[PDB]
C-alpha cells in the first residue's frame, strides 16, 4: 500500500493511501526517504488517511510523497547480537560499528503475559550487594525504581550490578538509554568498554544497548523503551532468562508520551500527562514480569519530576515499583560505597512470610536498629557521647560496623577504591548482619568492616585490621 503525504504538521504525517490502511501501529516507510523514515500509524484518520507519527525528523517532503507501509509495526532485530552493541530505536547500530547480525526480528509491541503464564509468586532477585539485597530484596522479574544522585558511579553501580548478578547468575541485561544525552550514553559506553562489561571483543557484554536520545521524536525515544522491552523479551522467553532491563529514564519516556499526545490532538490529562499515561505504563509494565521462562527484572532509573513523585505518574509508578532504590549521597559522603539510602531503599516484598522470616527479622531488626542508631546520631550530635549508655555505644559501633560492613569494595574501580569488589552469598549475608548485630566481634576495628565482601571476608578484613 502506498500513501501520500497529505499533511505534515510536524511529525504528524497524515498519509493518504488509496491503498490499504492496515491496523494501527504499522511502521510505514516513506518512499523518497533515504534515511529510514518510519511512520508509525497512529490513527486511521478516516477517509483513506491515517495519522502517523514520524518516528524520525522530517524534511524535504512533498505533499503526496509516496510511502510504503512496512505492513506491520516496527520490527527490530531481536537476538544475542545486541549484547555488546548499541542500536538505536530502529535498531540501527548507533554503536556505529557496522550492523548487527540478527535474523530474529520482532515488532516492538508485545504484551503482558496472559494470566495463566503468571508465575504467581515472585521470588527474590538476589542483588548480592549485601546491603542492597538486604534492604531491598529484589524480586526476580521485579521493578526496581532508581531514585538517585547521578553519575556517582551511578552507572558504576549499575555496571557493577550487571556484573554482580547478571554475570554471577548468568542473566542478561539491557540498557535502554531513553532520551539520554548522547554524551551520557557515550560516556557510559566507554565506561562499559572501560569496565570490560562491555567487551568489544565480545558482543556478550552482559548488556545490549539501545539508545533513543533526546533528538528523536518523543514517541520514538519512548519507543526505544518498547524496543528494549522487545529484546529483553527475547532473552527472557527465548533465552529463558532473567533479563535485566535497565532503563534511563522511565520518566523521560513519560514526558515523551505526553508530548505526543497534545500533538495527537489528545487531551492528555493531569500535568498535561497523557490520559493513557497509565495505560502506557500498564501495558509496558505488565509486559515486564517473570514469565515461566524467566524474568524481566526491570531496573528503572527514575528521574524525579518536579523533585516530586506524587506527580501522578511516579505516584502510579509506585504501584509498579516493588523495590526502591533510593541512592544516598550521604552514605557515599561517608565514603561508604555502597552509597545506597538504606532505610528508604526497601522492597515491599520484604516479608518474613516471604524472603525468609529470619532474613526479614534480621532486616527489620536491622532497619530498626539502623534507624535507632540513626536516632542516636542525633542525640549524640548534641549530647556528645558517653553521656549515654554503652549499649548505645555498643550498638553505635555495631551499627557502624554494620555500616562499614555494608561498604562493599568495588571491582573494576580499583582505580577509585584501591580495592576489588566482592560478591556475597546470601545466607552468610543474613547471618553476617545478624552476627554483627549479635556483636560477636567486639574487639575488631570497624574500619575493617569497611569495604568488605562476604562476612567471612569481613572477618578476614577484621583480622587484618585487628593487625
Amino acid at each position: 500500500t502506498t500513501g501520500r503525504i497529505v499533511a505534515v504538521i510536524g511529525a504528524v504525517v497524515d498519509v493518504q493511501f488509496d491503498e490499504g490502511l492496515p491496523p494501527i501501529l504499522n511502521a510505514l516507510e516513506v518512499q523518497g526517504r533515504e534515511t529510514r523514515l518510519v511512520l508509525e500509524v497512529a490513527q486511521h484518520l478516516g477517509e483513506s488517511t491515517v495519522r502517523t507519527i514520524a518516528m524520525d525528523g522530517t524534511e524535504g517532503l512533498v505533499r503526496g510523497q509516496k510511502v510504503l507501509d512496512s505492513g506491520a509495526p516496527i520490527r527490530i532485530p531481536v537476538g544475542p547480537e545486541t549484547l555488546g552493541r548499541i542500536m538505536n530505536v530502529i535498531g540501527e547500530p548507533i554503536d556505529e560499528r557496522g550492523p548487527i547480525k540478527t535474523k530474529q526480528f520482532a515488532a516492538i509491541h508485545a504484551e503482558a503475559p496472559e494470566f495463566v503464564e503468571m508465575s504467581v509468586e515472585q521470588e527474590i532477585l538476589v542483588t548480592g550487594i549485601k546491603v542492597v539485597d538486604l534492604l531491598a530484596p529484589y524480586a526476580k522479574g521485579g521493578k526496581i525504581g532508581l531514585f538517585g544522585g547521578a553519575g556517582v558511579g551511578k552507572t558504576v553501580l549499575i555496571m557493577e550490578l550487571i556484573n554482580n548478578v547478571a554475570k554471577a547468575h548468568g542473566g542478561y541485561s539491557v540498557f535502554a538509554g531513553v532520551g539520554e544525552r548522547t554524551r551520557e550514553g557515550n560516556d557510559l559506553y566507554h565506561e562499559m568498554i572501560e569496565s570490560g562489561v562491555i567487551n568489544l571483543k565480545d558482543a556478550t557484554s552482559k548488556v545490549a544497548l539501545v539508545y533513543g536520545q533526546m533528538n528523536e521524536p518523543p514517541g520514538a525515544r519512548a519507543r526505544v523503551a518498547l524496543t528494549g522491552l522487545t529484546v529483553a523479551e527475547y532473552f527472557r522467553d527465548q533465552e529463558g532468562q532473567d533479563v535485566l532491563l535497565f532503563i534511563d529514564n522511565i520518566f523521560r519516556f513519560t514526558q515523551a508520551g505526553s508530548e505526543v499526545s497534545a500533538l495527537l490532538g489528545r487531551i492528555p490529562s493531569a500535568v498535561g500527562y497523557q490520559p493513557t499515561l497509565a495505560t502506557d505504563m500498564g501495558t509496558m509494565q505488565e509486559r515486564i514480569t517473570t514469565t515461566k521462562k524467566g524474568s524481566i527484572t526491570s531496573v528503572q532509573a527514575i528521574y524525579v519530576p518536579a523533585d516530586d513523585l506524587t506527580d501522578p505518574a511516579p505516584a502510579t509508578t509506585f504501584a509498579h515499583l516493588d523495590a526502591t532504590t533510593v541512592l544516598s549521597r550521604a552514605i557515599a559522603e561517608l565514603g561508604i560505597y555502597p552509597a545506597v539510602d538504606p532505610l528508604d531503599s526497601t522492597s515491599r516484598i520484604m516479608d518474613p512470610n516471604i524472603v525468609g522470616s529470619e532474613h526479614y527479622d534480621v532486616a527489620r531488626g536491622v532497619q530498626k536498629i539502623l534507624q535507632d542508631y540513626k536516632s542516636l546520631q542525633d542525640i549524640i550530635a548534641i549530647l556528645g557521647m558517653d553521656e549515654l549508655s554503652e549499649e548505645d555505644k555498643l550498638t553505635v559501633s555495631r551499627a557502624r560496623k554494620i555500616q562499614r560492613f555494608l561498604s562493599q569494595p568495588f571491582q573494576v574501580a580499583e582505580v577509585f577504591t584501591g580495592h576489588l569488589g566482592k560478591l556475597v552469598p546470601l545466607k552468610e549475608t543474613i547471618k553476617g548482619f545478624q552476627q554483627i548485630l549479635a556483636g560477636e566481634y567486639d574487639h575488631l576495628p570497624e574500619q575493617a568492616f569497611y569495604m568488605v565482601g562476604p562476612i567471612e571476608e569481613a572477618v578476614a578484613k577484621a583480622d587484618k585490621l585487628a593487625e
Binding site: 486511521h44 487531551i267 493513557t276 500498564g282
Partner: protein, 509 residues
C-alpha cells in the same frame, strides 16, 4: 457540509443513490478509528446502550448515537483492527454472563475466564446496566459482619449491604488489608447460609496481573476462592474494560443479593477506575471537570454503589456489601472521588499508613475511621467490650494527644496511655491472621478489664496467642458458649476472667 462521510464511500453511492446497502442499521463500518473510539458509520437502527461486537470480535459499546455515526467506545485495541470495519451489533446492551460457578473462578470483566478453566459455567447473563433498587426494597442492616480483623470489625462495626470505604495510601499490603478480610469470611463460608456467608467478588481494577497472580494464589491457598469471583480487569486492561469491571461486578452482586444472598463485592479500586473513566471521557473529549474529572463520576459511583444495599425479604433480604477501595495519594480527599465516596459510603476506613510503615499492623486511622452506621452492625458481646474500648481508646488517643509531657500525669491517664499501648497490641493482629469473633472479644476483654496492664506491651500479643492456644485447647468450651450467646455472659466473663487469670498464671505471672 463538514461532518464527514462527504468524501467517504458513504456519499460514494449516495451520489448514485445510496446504491447497494445492507445495514448501517445493525452493523456499521468504522468511519474513523482512533482512540479506541470507533466512529462507526451506520449501525443506525441500533439500540441505546448497545454492546456491540467488532469484526475483530472485540466489543464496543454504542454510547453515542450521533445522527451520523455511532461513537462506539471500543473495549479493546485498534492495533487489532482498522478502518471501515464491520461493527456488528450484538443487538444487545451490556449484560455480563452471571453465574455462581464463577465462585471458584477468576474472570475477566467480559465475564470470560481468565481462570483458564475454559468457559464459565455461567449460563445466565445479567445486565451490567442493572438498576439500583428502591428505597423500600432496601432495608436496614441489622446484620453485623466481620473481616476477622478484630480491630476493624470492632471499631468499624460492619453489616452486609454496607458501602464502606477502604481508604489509605500505598500497598501496605493495602490489598493485604482486604485479603485478611476475605480470609475470615471463609469460616463463614465454612459456616452456613447465604447470609451467614458472603460471596466475595473481588473486582480488581487496574491491579496488574502480577498482583492478581499472587493474590489469587493466596485465595487459592485459602481456597475461599471457592465462594469467590474475582472479576479482574488488571492494569493492562483496556480502559472501558477496566471501567466495565465494577459494573460487571455490579450485575453480579445484585444477583446474589437477588438470589437472597449476601454478597460482598469489594470494589477494588475505584481510583483506578475513575482515572480510566475520566480518561475515557476525555478521550471522548467529553470533558473533565473539576480536578480533571468530569462530574458524573460521582454519578458513576452512585450508580455503581447504590446498587449495593441490604434489602428486605421481599427483596430477598439481599445484600451486596460493597467494599470499595480508594488508595489515597496523601489523604487527598477533596480529591473528588474521595469526596464522593465518603458521601456515598456508609463509612470509611482510614488507615494511618505511616504507622503501618512504623510497623503497625493493623495501622488504622481509627479516629477517622468511622461507621456512622455503627450500632446495627454489632453484637452485644462486642458491644460490651468493644463499645467501651472504642470509647476508652477515645481517651487513649486523647491522651496520646498530650504526649509532650508524658505519663507523669495521674495514674488513670498514665495508664490510659499504657493501657492504650496494650490495646494497641491487641488491636494489632498479624496480617494473614483473621480470627473468629468470640475469641476476639475475649482477647480484647482482658486488656480492657485491665488485666494485662501489668504486662509490657510485647507480652500482650504474646499472651494473646498463648492465651489463644490455651482457650483453643481448653476453653474451647467457653468459646462454644460465647459463640452461642452472641453476648458475653456474667459467667462467661467470670470464667473468662478466670481463664485469663489461669492463662495469665500460665503465661508467666
Amino acid at each position: 457540509k463538514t461532518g464527514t462521510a462527504e468524501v467517504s464511500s458513504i456519499l460514494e453511492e449516495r451520489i448514485l443513490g445510496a446504491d447497494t446497502s445492507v445495514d448501517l442499521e445493525e452493523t456499521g463500518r468504522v468511519l474513523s478509528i482512533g482512540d479506541g473510539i470507533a466512529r462507526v458509520h451506520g449501525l443506525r437502527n441500533v439500540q441505546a446502550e448497545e454492546m456491540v461486537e467488532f469484526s475483530s470480535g472485540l466489543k464496543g459499546m454504542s454510547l453515542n448515537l450521533e445522527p451520523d455515526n455511532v461513537g462506539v467506545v471500543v473495549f479493546g485495541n485498534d492495533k487489532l483492527i482498522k478502518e471501515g470495519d464491520i461493527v456488528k451489533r450484538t443487538g444487545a446492551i451490556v449484560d455480563v454472563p452471571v453465574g455462581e460457578e464463577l465462585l471458584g473462578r477468576v474472570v475477566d470483566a467480559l465475564g470470560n475466564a481468565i481462570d483458564g478453566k475454559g468457559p464459565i459455567g455461567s449460563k445466565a447473563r445479567r445486565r451490567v446496566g442493572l438498576k439500583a433498587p428502591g428505597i423500600i426494597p432496601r432495608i436496614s442492616v441489622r446484620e453485623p459482619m466481620q473481616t476477622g480483623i478484630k480491630a476493624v470489625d470492632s471499631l468499624v462495626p460492619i453489616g452486609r449491604g454496607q458501602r464502606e470505604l477502604i481508604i489509605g495510601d500505598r500497598q501496605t499490603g493495602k490489598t493485604s488489608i482486604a485479603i485478611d478480610t476475605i480470609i475470615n469470611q471463609k469460616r463463614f463460608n465454612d459456616g452456613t447460609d447465604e447470609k451467614k456467608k458472603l460471596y466475595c467478588i473481588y473486582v480488581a481494577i487496574g491491579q496488574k496481573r502480577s498482583t492478581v497472580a499472587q493474590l489469587v494464589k493466596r485465595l487459592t491457598d485459602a481456597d475461599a476462592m471457592k465462594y469467590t469471583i474475582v472479576v479482574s480487569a488488571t492494569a493492562s486492561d483496556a480502559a472501558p474494560l477496566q471501567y466495565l469491571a465494577p459494573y460487571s461486578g455490579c450485575s453480579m452482586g445484585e444477583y446474589f443479593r437477588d438470589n437472597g444472598k449476601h454478597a460482598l463485592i469489594i470494589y477494588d479500586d475505584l481510583s483506578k477506575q475513575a482515572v480510566a473513566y475520566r480518561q475515557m471521557s476525555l478521550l471522548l473529549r467529553r470533558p473533565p471537570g473539576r480536578e480533571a474529572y468530569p462530574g458524573d463520576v460521582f454519578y458513576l459511583h452512585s450508580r455503581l454503589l447504590e446498587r449495593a444495599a441490604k434489602m428486605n425479604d421481599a427483596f430477598g433480604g439481599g445484600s451486596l456489601t460493597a467494599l470499595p477501595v480508594i488508595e489515597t495519594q496523601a489523604g487527598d480527599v477533596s480529591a473528588y472521588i474521595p469526596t464522593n465516596v465518603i458521601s456515598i459510603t456508609d463509612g470509611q476506613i482510614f488507615l494511618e499508613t505511616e504507622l503501618f510503615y512504623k510497623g503497625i499492623r493493623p495501622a488504622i486511622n481509627v479516629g477517622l475511621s468511622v461507621s456512622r452506621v455503627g450500632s446495627a452492625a454489632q453484637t452485644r458481646a462486642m458491644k460490651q467490650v468493644a463499645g467501651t474500648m472504642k470509647l476508652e481508646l477515645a481517651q487513649y488517643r486523647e491522651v496520646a494527644a498530650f504526649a509532650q509531657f508524658g505519663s507523669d500525669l495521674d495514674a488513670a491517664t498514665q495508664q490510659l496511655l499504657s493501657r492504650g499501648v496494650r490495646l494497641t497490641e491487641l488491636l494489632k493482629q498479624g496480617q494473614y491472621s483473621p480470627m473468629a469473633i468470640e475469641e476476639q472479644v475475649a482477647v480484647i476483654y482482658a486488656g480492657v478489664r485491665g488485666y494485662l496492664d501489668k504486662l509490657e506491651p510485647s507480652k500482650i500479643t504474646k499472651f494473646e496467642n498463648a492465651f489463644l492456644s490455651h482457650v483453643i485447647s481448653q476453653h474451647q468450651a467457653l468459646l462454644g458458649k460465647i459463640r452461642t450467646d452472641g453476648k458475653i455472659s456474667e459467667e462467661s466473663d467470670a470464667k473468662l476472667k478466670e481463664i485469663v487469670t489461669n492463662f495469665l498464671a500460665g503465661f508467666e505471672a
